[PDB]
Amino acid sequence: NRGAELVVDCLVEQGVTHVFGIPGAKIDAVFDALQDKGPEIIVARHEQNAAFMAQAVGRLTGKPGVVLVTSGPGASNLATGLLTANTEGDPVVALAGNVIRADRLKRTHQSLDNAALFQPITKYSVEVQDVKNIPEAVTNAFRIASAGQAGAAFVSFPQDVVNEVTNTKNVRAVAAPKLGPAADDAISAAIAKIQTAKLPVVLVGMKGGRPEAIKAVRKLLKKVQLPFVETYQAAGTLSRDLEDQYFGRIGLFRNQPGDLLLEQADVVLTIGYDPIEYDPKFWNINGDRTIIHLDEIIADIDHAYQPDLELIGDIPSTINHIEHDAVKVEFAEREQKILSDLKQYMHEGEQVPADWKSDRAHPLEIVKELRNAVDDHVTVTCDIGSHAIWMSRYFRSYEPLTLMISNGMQTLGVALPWAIGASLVKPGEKVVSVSGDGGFLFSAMELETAVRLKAPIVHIVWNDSTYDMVAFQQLKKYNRTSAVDFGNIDIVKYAESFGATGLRVESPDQLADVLRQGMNAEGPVIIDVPVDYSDNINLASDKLPKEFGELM
Amino acid sequence: NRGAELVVDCLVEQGVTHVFGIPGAKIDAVFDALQDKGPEIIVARHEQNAAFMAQAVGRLTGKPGVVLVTSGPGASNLATGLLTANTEGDPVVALAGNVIRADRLKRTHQSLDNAALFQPITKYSVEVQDVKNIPEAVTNAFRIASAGQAGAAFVSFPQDVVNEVTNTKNVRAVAAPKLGPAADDAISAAIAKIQTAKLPVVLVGMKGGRPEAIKAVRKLLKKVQLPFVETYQAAGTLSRDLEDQYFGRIGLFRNQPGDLLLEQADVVLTIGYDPIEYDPKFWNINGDRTIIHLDEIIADIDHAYQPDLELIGDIPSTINHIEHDAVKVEFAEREQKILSDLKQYMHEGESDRAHPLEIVKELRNAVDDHVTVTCDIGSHAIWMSRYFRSYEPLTLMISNGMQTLGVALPWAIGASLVKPGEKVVSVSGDGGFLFSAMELETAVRLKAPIVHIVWNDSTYDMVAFQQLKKYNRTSAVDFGNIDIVKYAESFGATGLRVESPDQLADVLRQGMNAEGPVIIDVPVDYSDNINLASDKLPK
Amino acid sequence: KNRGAELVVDCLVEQGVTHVFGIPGAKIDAVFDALQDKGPEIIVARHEQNAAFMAQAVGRLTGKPGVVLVTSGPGASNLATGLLTANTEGDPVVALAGNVIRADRLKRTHQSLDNAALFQPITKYSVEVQDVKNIPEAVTNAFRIASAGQAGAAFVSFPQDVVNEVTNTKNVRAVAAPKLGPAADDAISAAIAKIQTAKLPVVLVGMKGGRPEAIKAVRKLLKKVQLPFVETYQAAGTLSRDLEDQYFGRIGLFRNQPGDLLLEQADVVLTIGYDPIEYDPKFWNINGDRTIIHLDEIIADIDHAYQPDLELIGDIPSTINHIEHDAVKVEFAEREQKILSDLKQYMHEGEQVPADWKSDRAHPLEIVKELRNAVDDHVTVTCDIGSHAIWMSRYFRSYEPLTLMISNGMQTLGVALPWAIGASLVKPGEKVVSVSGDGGFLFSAMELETAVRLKAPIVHIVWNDSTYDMVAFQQLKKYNRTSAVDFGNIDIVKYAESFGATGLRVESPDQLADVLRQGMNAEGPVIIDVPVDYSDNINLASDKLPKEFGELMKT
Numbered sequence A: 001n002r003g004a005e006l007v008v009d010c011l012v013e014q015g016v017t018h019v020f021g022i023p024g025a026k027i028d029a030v031f032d033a034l035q036d037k038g039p040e041i042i043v044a045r046h047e048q049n050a051a052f053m054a055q056a057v058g059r060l061t062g063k064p065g066v067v068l069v070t071s072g073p074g075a076s077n078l079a080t081g082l083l084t085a086n087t088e089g090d091p092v093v094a095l096a097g098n099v100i101r102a103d104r105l106k107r108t109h110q111s112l113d114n115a116a117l118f119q120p121i122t123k124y125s126v127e128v129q130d131v132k133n134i135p136e137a138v139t140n141a142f143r144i145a146s147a148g149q150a151g152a153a154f155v156s157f158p159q160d161v162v163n164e165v166t167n168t169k170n171v172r173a174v175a176a177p178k179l180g181p182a183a184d185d186a187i188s189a190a191i192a193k194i195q196t197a198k199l200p201v202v203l204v205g206m207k208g209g210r211p212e213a214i215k216a217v218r219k220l221l222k223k224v225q226l227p228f229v230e231t232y233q234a235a236g237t238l239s240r241d242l243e244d245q246y247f248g249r250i251g252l253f254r255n256q257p258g259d260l261l262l263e264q265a266d267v268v269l270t271i272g273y274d275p276i277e278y279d280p281k282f283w284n285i286n287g288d289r290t291i292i293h294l295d296e297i298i299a300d301i302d303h304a305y306q307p308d309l310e311l312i313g314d315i316p317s318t319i320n321h322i323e324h325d326a327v328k329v330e331f332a333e334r335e336q337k338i339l340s341d342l343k344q345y346m347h348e349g350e351q352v353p354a355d356w357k358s359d360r361a362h363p364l365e366i367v368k369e370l371r372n373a374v375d376d377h378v379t380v381t382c383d384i385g386s387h388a389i390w391m392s393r394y395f396r397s398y399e400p401l402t403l404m405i406s407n408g409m410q411t412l413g414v415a416l417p418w419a420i421g422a423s424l425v426k427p428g429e430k431v432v433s434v435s436g437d438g439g440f441l442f443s444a445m446e447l448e449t450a451v452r453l454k455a456p457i458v459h460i461v462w463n464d465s466t467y468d469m470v471a472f473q474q475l476k477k478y479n480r481t482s483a484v485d486f487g488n489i490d491i492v493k494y495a496e497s498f499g500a501t502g503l504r505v506e507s508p509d510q511l512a513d514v515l516r517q518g519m520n521a522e523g524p525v526i527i528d529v530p531v532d533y534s535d536n537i538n539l540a541s542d543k544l545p546k547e548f549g550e551l552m
Numbered sequence B: 001n002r003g004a005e006l007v008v009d010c011l012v013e014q015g016v017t018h019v020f021g022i023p024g025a026k027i028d029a030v031f032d033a034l035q036d037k038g039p040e041i042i043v044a045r046h047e048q049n050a051a052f053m054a055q056a057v058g059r060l061t062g063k064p065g066v067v068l069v070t071s072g073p074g075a076s077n078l079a080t081g082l083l084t085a086n087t088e089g090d091p092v093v094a095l096a097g098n099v100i101r102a103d104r105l106k107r108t109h110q111s112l113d114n115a116a117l118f119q120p121i122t123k124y125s126v127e128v129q130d131v132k133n134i135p136e137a138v139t140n141a142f143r144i145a146s147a148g149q150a151g152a153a154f155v156s157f158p159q160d161v162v163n164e165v166t167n168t169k170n171v172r173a174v175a176a177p178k179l180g181p182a183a184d185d186a187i188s189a190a191i192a193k194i195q196t197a198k199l200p201v202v203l204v205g206m207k208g209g210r211p212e213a214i215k216a217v218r219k220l221l222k223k224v225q226l227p228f229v230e231t232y233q234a235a236g237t238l239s240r241d242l243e244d245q246y247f248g249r250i251g252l253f254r255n256q257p258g259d260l261l262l263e264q265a266d267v268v269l270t271i272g273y274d275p276i277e278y279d280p281k282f283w284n285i286n287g288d289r290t291i292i293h294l295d296e297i298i299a300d301i302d303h304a305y306q307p308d309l310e311l312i313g314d315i316p317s318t319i320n321h322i323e324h325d326a327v328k329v330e331f332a333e334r335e336q337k338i339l340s341d342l343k344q345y346m347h348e349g350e351s352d353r354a355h356p357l358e359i360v361k362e363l364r365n366a367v368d369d370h371v372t373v374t375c376d377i378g379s380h381a382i383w384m385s386r387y388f389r390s391y392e393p394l395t396l397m398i399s400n401g402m403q404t405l406g407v408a409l410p411w412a413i414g415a416s417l418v419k420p421g422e423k424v425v426s427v428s429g430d431g432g433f434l435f436s437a438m439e440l441e442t443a444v445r446l447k448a449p450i451v452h453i454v455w456n457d458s459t460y461d462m463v464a465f466q467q468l469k470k471y472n473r474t475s476a477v478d479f480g481n482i483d484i485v486k487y488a489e490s491f492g493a494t495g496l497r498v499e500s501p502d503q504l505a506d507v508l509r510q511g512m513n514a515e516g517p518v519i520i521d522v523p524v525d526y527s528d529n530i531n532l533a534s535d536k537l538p539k
Numbered sequence C: 001k002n003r004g005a006e007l008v009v010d011c012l013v014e015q016g017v018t019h020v021f022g023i024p025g026a027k028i029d030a031v032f033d034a035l036q037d038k039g040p041e042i043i044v045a046r047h048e049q050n051a052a053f054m055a056q057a058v059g060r061l062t063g064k065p066g067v068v069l070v071t072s073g074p075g076a077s078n079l080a081t082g083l084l085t086a087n088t089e090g091d092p093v094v095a096l097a098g099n100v101i102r103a104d105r106l107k108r109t110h111q112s113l114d115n116a117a118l119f120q121p122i123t124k125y126s127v128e129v130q131d132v133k134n135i136p137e138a139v140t141n142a143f144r145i146a147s148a149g150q151a152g153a154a155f156v157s158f159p160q161d162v163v164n165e166v167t168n169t170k171n172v173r174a175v176a177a178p179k180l181g182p183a184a185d186d187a188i189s190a191a192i193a194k195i196q197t198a199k200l201p202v203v204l205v206g207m208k209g210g211r212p213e214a215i216k217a218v219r220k221l222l223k224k225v226q227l228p229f230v231e232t233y234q235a236a237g238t239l240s241r242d243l244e245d246q247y248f249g250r251i252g253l254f255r256n257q258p259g260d261l262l263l264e265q266a267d268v269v270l271t272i273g274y275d276p277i278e279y280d281p282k283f284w285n286i287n288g289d290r291t292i293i294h295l296d297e298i299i300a301d302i303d304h305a306y307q308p309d310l311e312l313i314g315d316i317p318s319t320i321n322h323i324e325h326d327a328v329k330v331e332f333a334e335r336e337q338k339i340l341s342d343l344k345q346y347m348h349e350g351e352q353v354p355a356d357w358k359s360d361r362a363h364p365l366e367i368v369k370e371l372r373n374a375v376d377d378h379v380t381v382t383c384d385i386g387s388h389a390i391w392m393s394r395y396f397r398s399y400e401p402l403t404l405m406i407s408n409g410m411q412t413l414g415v416a417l418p419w420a421i422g423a424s425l426v427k428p429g430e431k432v433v434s435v436s437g438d439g440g441f442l443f444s445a446m447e448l449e450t451a452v453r454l455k456a457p458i459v460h461i462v463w464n465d466s467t468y469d470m471v472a473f474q475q476l477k478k479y480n481r482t483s484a485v486d487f488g489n490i491d492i493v494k495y496a497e498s499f500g501a502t503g504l505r506v507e508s509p510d511q512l513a514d515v516l517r518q519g520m521n522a523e524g525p526v527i528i529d530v531p532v533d534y535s536d537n538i539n540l541a542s543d544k545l546p547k548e549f550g551e552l553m554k555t
């Protein structure tokens, strides 16, 4: 019963089932303590992927995912991982080791100021300097990682602290509390402003993408019949019932129907809106608009964002109090016409161009065939790139937490490790991950962990042989691409070398059969599907806002 | 004519030959400027390895390696990379982008305090907030990265700053100056203590592992005939002439002849000694000895390290002034016997699979002296660090500061670019391999003549055997195997395999004569590893 | 003309700032120049520390952030302790400081440092604006964060070229920080349930319970349910004269109070806005399992001695009201009534001067009482740090919200007098009383010029013993000897007159009552030198009371 046991004791109380990590000499006492009791250790092939996996656990379970690494380069490898989780509202607790307290100021092996390093990228970055303080520090980490808004917590343990034998008792895993609903006066005022609105619309954001949030949002949308829009991490709010009120997903560029829908609005209700997904300077422009901020925390005042009302409190509760006293909105003919046109423009946008001819599959063809090959309840984790732009915009998701996208840091390589984390959260279910050919290699080494776990993952690789998202953004600004090209690899040979299944779409017509082959395959499968990116530049085309400008 | 050009203008003037990086929306303006002029861009497969490559360029060329990344996750991926370079005396300049100055406080895509993040892990972390300040900020970053002790410098560029058009002129790339040698009276006082010493020993350290230092160290060792020892990053100090005065490499555990040699000495002269490689509480113990600190910067006072003399100045110059007025030391009979027994003990220290010691030697005999050999981190690195002889400066590169996993392969890639047309050998573990194995694509793309050796045991053994000595059980050290040959072939590279311990020498030669990147899978018996921490030898 | 500096003033206008405390400088002068055309009144301070203190006092009294404006370099670095104090004591403060131009920000140039990096670990919000357009946003969010629970300090740094930069940027609406709804309904119901079933339920009113609107609601709860309650030092003023029979003093510093013994005997403790800085839970929540109910605007910090069984997070007054609405009077059993009776008795004996007392100087308890009797309930009393503060914090009764201000977070020396000046600006035309030690006096005594300049009606009481006594008696108790606590005397009367202020002196303990009335009736700043006998001070850390109660209870 030494300090390392205390760390494990906390993990038990927090109900931690899995720990992702990589052992080392400085953190060895805690890994040793985990052999006697505590959660199952998932050994990672890189601490970055260990942090990503934990993030996936966080977003899916609502409870902090736990990552355990050693001092020095082990700790510093969690940097990007935690930074992503901290900016994308995913509860993660990081446990890292450090050199002994007596040599903490010295130039010794793997020593640095851990707490100072993770300070600007976490909600909580502390280093325990007394063994008695372990149960407190770790508990407060779990609570703070979870408390709205969710984020990353980092706890550093000097080696002599985790090895120290102590008679210190454990501490109760007091659950993070939930707020009450927003102020009654604030809700009453909000209902009033929505009822008097000529065209009210709902902007569902990050924290609205929580399951219980989605549950309450849907009840509201059905009763009041408001047209709504999603941010990328709000994917899954849409139901097939609410398809007639759905106006797509806003993000990246102001050239979507939702942006035009938001423009026409006179009252906008934002739900759990972290502006990181889409800056308000992009959508809230052109005329005085009423903004009602509903969130678990106060609003960030921007030039383009100055809420006329703030409903701060538990997001689902606050929505419930609104939905109860709200009544159906009747739209005038003019507003109905606008909604009709936008829904028309929206449908026109989801279609492959008529003049299309190619040896490869169009991105929309890859999107459509994938959704029809994947059940609604199946979790799909997506990477970042041009492929991500298509997925975020056109891949429909009808259930909470089934389309995971990195819309905070837009970190390359998140797809596959999220999928591995997701499969452990939902055992016995197939999990689909989508990535680019460039972003793939960022975390492809974690495929060994997949085969080892026999995880039912289907990884789709959009093959263009370039960092295209940077490329077409270079062409639009400088009329030339720079440092976006790299060599190709045999993706099938790559998979097979890890002990996984590798398939390949040789022709655009084989797409449907290859996908279903993978969805029925056993174990991890990587799928190489070449794509034609000649239409990608139109993702930033302002043709659509122009057409609607003239029509108005 | 805009801020991005200024960054490149500095890179030109600094004589930067290569920039390793990955583009992004915020830093693309500088990537755009590199199309018209400036160094050749090497697109990496991960910013971690791009930073590693730059570290190798720094360690090999003496001028800072440059890495250029984007905002957000681009910047934060440099964390381990820069931290490694900063604690291992390798000059690196990192250039990262950031969000618009007007939105620097907002929750927007890829925003963080870049400068605040790299503060605890660099010698210099600044963020430029005015376009005029670019040539200054960049120039001083290079100077500080180079200045003793060398390390990592980080410069963050708001997107609007690199895109802003200005008529600001560039700034001259003033070279970091060299110090003069240590004080004359200080040099004389040191020489006095050495000639009167019964058993004087030289500890060549990190900053002694520099080329000009080694050249100057060797002249001192030949003339005075001093017994010396190496640290892991001091590999290459040994010459084939000086085999008779060499007493191995100290590190990791106190069970080496060197630890015992230093113990018996009464006066020890340390040269460019960073205590990060081996804490002085391990060797400077059993009895009072006089310590003379020779370095480019002052010493860190430790309980086991309190110098009686500090000769601070240019390392080679200070050494030359010693070598000039020093004379040969005659060793007494007792002391000569101690030196004799330990050199005997040294050789004394030197299955279905191949033994580690078999793999070290057979590689040395299969590899030319001038060929640079990069090593990763693990148990295999311990065998290499202790028994792989290097007879030329900068031919055995080891990460002895952070002990960072995955450094082997990208260092080799950086090296092939530094020494074009030369073969480069990299050694790594099977666990440490996948950390940066995706950078093999960059090697094949560059057609770099790299030879990678993978020690195959299927575990994180260095953690494993230290667990058995502490808790008598291993924890979280096991993982599955992969087909390394198929892996190589999938990248368009050559894959070989040692099926039997006798095939070792022939497979090695195949790779050394092969064209392009080659990976070699060699299985190892690690049942002997546990003796590395055995206290048998000191007893 | 519309320049960057104007945007800063425009924000202050929309925020409804009436006063700005500061000291001008070369880097921040553009904002000072802009304040000449429009904006709040500038209060020139004699040290930036006191400007931070005064701004803090305005925040604690008005609930809106007090504003402090300084220059680059040492001007900014002088705000360190001031802001650190406000940040740990729930007082809204916005600090606006200048810095060198963006082009020389990395250079060794005059008064350059990383302003933001310095104030990062001691404020809720420390940013530096690097674009003139971003000013109205940065500042507005600064005010909101400083006010948002838990209230604290925000620091905004302006490069000289940024505030001097001419820009056509529109201002941004001063959107008010919103209030939470009350705590969760099921959580409140569960709380009432655990309170009704309690043998001895007690309320611990803490820092955030000491706010006016909080106190209003707490009292209604206390009257209806008839719960015994206790105060922390910054919760002073919750007590009403109605509630005297349920009041059990103020816990703090040392565990030797009736309140500490009351909490020990309780089986259910309701904490209200309890920041543990004032008194760590390892001191009071000991010796047996107790049910803890954390009521606050933010979640709880889990300690070994503090692991709540229930958390009611939401607006503090609103949450209390829902409790008060559905709660009923608590009936105490015979055993519990006696425990309350004995403790209420022990409490009364503690507030009394010892019978064998004789001295040429005034006893601390005499100075407290005579001051309380010379001062109206509504008159704000600011207290400094030292042994005198212990007497005041424990024995000076306060019967209205925000009439006894104490620095109980950082325990910063010198806060008394500048707080009074800030108070004097908040309640113009009202007398303000400040209490300090002779050591803590000189830390900020130079602000006496600022009082005299404003002709503020302040009455400053200086406890004269000629030592750092609070350190001294704690040294004798730990080391059997004092170290570095002694210093020379100054003529406090002559000191006041030299600033143009009134100086009085209590030459004999009977003149005490008379001198105070003389001061309370004097015009302009008044300093009062009153000598004190500190021979009884060591009993403040005496463990006699817990010992007697230990024996009396084991009976």
Ligand SMILES: Cc1ncc(C[n+]2csc(CCOP(=O)(O)OP(=O)(O)O)c2C)c(N)n1
Pocket: A384, A385, A386, A387, A388, A409, A410, A411, A412, A435, A436, A437, A438, A439, A440, A462, A464, A465, A466, A467, A468, A469, A470, B022, B023, B024, B025, B070, B073, B074, B077
């Ligand atoms: C760690 C990191 N580095 C750089 C970037 C910038 N970036 C955004 S998209 C992209 C390239 C994606 O390449 P790929 O995997 O091939 O997908 P594609 O764009 O081709 O669809 C890059 C480098 C990033 N978002 N994260």
Ligand SMILES: Cc1ncc(C[n+]2csc(CCOP(=O)(O)OP(=O)(O)O)c2C)c(N)n1
Pocket: A022, A023, A024, A025, A070, A073, A074, A077, B377, B378, B379, B380, B381, B402, B403, B404, B405, B428, B429, B430, B431, B432, B433, B455, B457, B459, B460, B461, B462, B463
């Ligand atoms: C980035 C990083 N993660 C973890 C460690 C801790 N560590 C030191 S050696 C080692 C395992 C080495 O495995 P391998 O590559 O197979 O070499 P081997 O032990 O088998 O010789 C680990 C995980 C480290 N030094 N750096």
Ligand SMILES: Cc1ncc(C[n+]2csc(CCOP(=O)(O)OP(=O)(O)O)c2C)c(N)n1
Pocket: C385, C386, C387, C388, C389, C410, C411, C412, C413, C436, C437, C438, C439, C440, C441, C463, C465, C467, C468, C469, C470, C471
């Ligand atoms: C800035 C600061 N310095 C030191 C202390 C420690 N301290 C607390 S009370 C005290 C001495 C108080 O002297 P005085 O004002 O004369 O009051 P007295 O103790 O005599 O009642 C000291 C030094 C502190 N709380 N803050």
Ligand SMILES: [Mg+2]
Pocket: A385, A436, A437, A438, A439, A462, A463, A464, A465, A466, A467, A468
């Ligand atoms: Mg691609």
Ligand SMILES: [Mg+2]
Pocket: B378, B429, B430, B431, B455, B456, B457, B458, B459, B460, B461
């Ligand atoms: Mg291995």
Ligand SMILES: [Mg+2]
Pocket: C437, C438, C439, C463, C464, C465, C466, C467, C468, C469
């Ligand atoms: Mg005193």
